[PDB]
Amino acid sequence: SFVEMVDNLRGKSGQGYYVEMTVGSPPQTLNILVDTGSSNFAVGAAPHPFLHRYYQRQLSSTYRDLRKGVYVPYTQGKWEGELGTDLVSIPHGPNVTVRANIAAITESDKFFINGSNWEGILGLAYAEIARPDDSLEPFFDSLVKQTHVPNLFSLQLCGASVGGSMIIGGIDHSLYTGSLWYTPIRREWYYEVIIVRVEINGQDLKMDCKEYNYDKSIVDSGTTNLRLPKKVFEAAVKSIKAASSTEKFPDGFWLGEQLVCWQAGTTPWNIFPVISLYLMGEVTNQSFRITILPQQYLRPVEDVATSQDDCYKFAISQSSTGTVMGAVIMEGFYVVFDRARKRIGFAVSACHVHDEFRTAAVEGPFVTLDMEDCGYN
């Protein structure tokens, strides 16, 4: 019955992936951004220039006020609203209805995106990072408690306008090839993992592996880019610059500001290196790696000019709050959030990214000593 959930995600490049949901009685249909990097379920509940529609509490006979305010500040963007509960369903999901916490967004800043087609956010991470506090039960915890849906879901985000799948309650084996490789969830707040080694074009960055996880590493479908701590970011940019010194780019390109362009069909993919992230495995001294193609961290963008060339933005950003494995990393992999077994699985997606001589990969096993020391304390 998982086939009913295949291809239930849609989105625009750089504007996230969303699923169709209904809230209230009678059902109100809304597109909800799926975000594994937060734990609040929130919807537009008041007019906004970028909102096509929104939740109208007054029309829901099953709405209940919680008489408590709420606000969420993300790394970029924020909103504030009113808490309440209502009945929720997922048309292209499991065949159930749950009573869930809903933050009715009444005011927001640089959160909704002009013409993005989604009107709310579904935070899939754990209660610990829920606002206002961990007693506000997140959506997925409610789903699992109230129904027979097993405590795991999987995400297949397909790249370049974009689509994918959120398999709720299980794993759909037709969505990936090869074996699934699992990494422990270090702590149940964000989906936190431990990166134990980083290579660029097969060259180890040779840093204290604690730097990779300073101060945490998370898997976050609500973030576009791969975000790296200052020290790691500088090493990676230095390495990617050197591999691609055949050509020249504005330095604002390396900051994610300016885009770069090439004559349609002549993007010089070969001069951009592949990036390998090694993740802590399930057995002692064992890791596995995921390999990222340049087609993943060079995000295609529409050229606002009279030209119809190939234009891209550098989708690796500097971070001050740890490593973020964002959407461009998850694209091309099938990612299993196995909450029941405190682990996250990776496999090559059926909608994988294609190069001519190179391929994205999930390979193991590897031996890695002292992986324990890579976690930050």
Ligand X SMILES: CC(C)c1cccc(CNCC(O)(O)[C@@H]2C[C@H](C)CCCCCCCCC(=O)N(C)[C@@H](C)C(=O)N2)c1
Comparing CA positions, the residue from 136, 279, 103, 257 lying closest to residue 196 is: 279
Query: Residue 229: enclosing H or E segment and its boundaries?
Result: strand 226-229
Examine residue 244 and tell whether it contacts ligand X (CB under 6 A).
Answer: no
CB 256, CB 267: distance < 8 Å: no
Question: Site for ligand X (CB under 6 A): how many residues?
Answer: 19
Examine residue 15 and tell whether it contacts ligand X (CB under 6 A).
Answer: yes
CB of 321 to ligand X, least distance (A): 6
Residue 35 is among the residues annotated as catalytic for this protein: yes
Give the binding range for ligand X (CB under 6 A) out of 218-226, 291-299, 329-337, 340-348.
218-226
The alpha carbon dihedral of 324, 188, 131, 28 has a sign of positive
Residue whose entry in the numeric block shows the structure tokens 């997925």: 140
List the interface residues with ligand X, window 48-107 (CB under 6 A). Answer: 72, 74-77
CB of 31 to ligand X, least distance (A): 12
Residue 220 is among the residues annotated as catalytic for this protein: yes
- Residue 160 CB: number of other CB atoms within 10 A? 11
Q: What is the DSSP letter of 212?
A: H
Examine residue 229 and tell whether it contacts ligand X (CB under 6 A).
Answer: no
List the interface residues with ligand X, window 268-297 (CB under 6 A). Answer: none
| Beta-bridge partner residues of 323 | 217
What are the DSSP E strand ranges found in 36-186? 41-44, 64-73, 78-89, 98-109, 120-123, 153-158, 162-168, 176-184
Cα dihedral 366, 367, 372, 373 in deg (nearest 10): -100
Residue from 8, 28, 31, 38 touching ligand X (CB under 6 A): that is 38
Residue from 119, 199, 220, 338 touching ligand X (CB under 6 A): that is 220
Q: Going residue by residue from 174 to 203, which x/- string records binding to ligand X, judged by CB under 6 A?
A: ------------------------------
Residue from 24, 37, 44, 138 touching ligand X (CB under 6 A): that is 37
Examine residue 164 and tell whether it contacts ligand X (CB under 6 A).
Answer: no
Residue from 32, 121, 122, 259 touching ligand X (CB under 6 A): that is 121
Write the single-letter amino acid at 296: Q
CA–CA separation, 365 and 252 (whole Å): 39
Examine residue 223 and tell whether it contacts ligand X (CB under 6 A).
Answer: yes
CB of 306 to ligand X, least distance (A): 27
Question: Where in the sequence numbering do the catalytic residues fall?
Answer: 35, 220
Give contact residues for ligand X (rule: CB under 6 A). Answer: 15-16, 33, 35, 37-38, 72, 74-77, 111, 121, 129, 220, 222-225
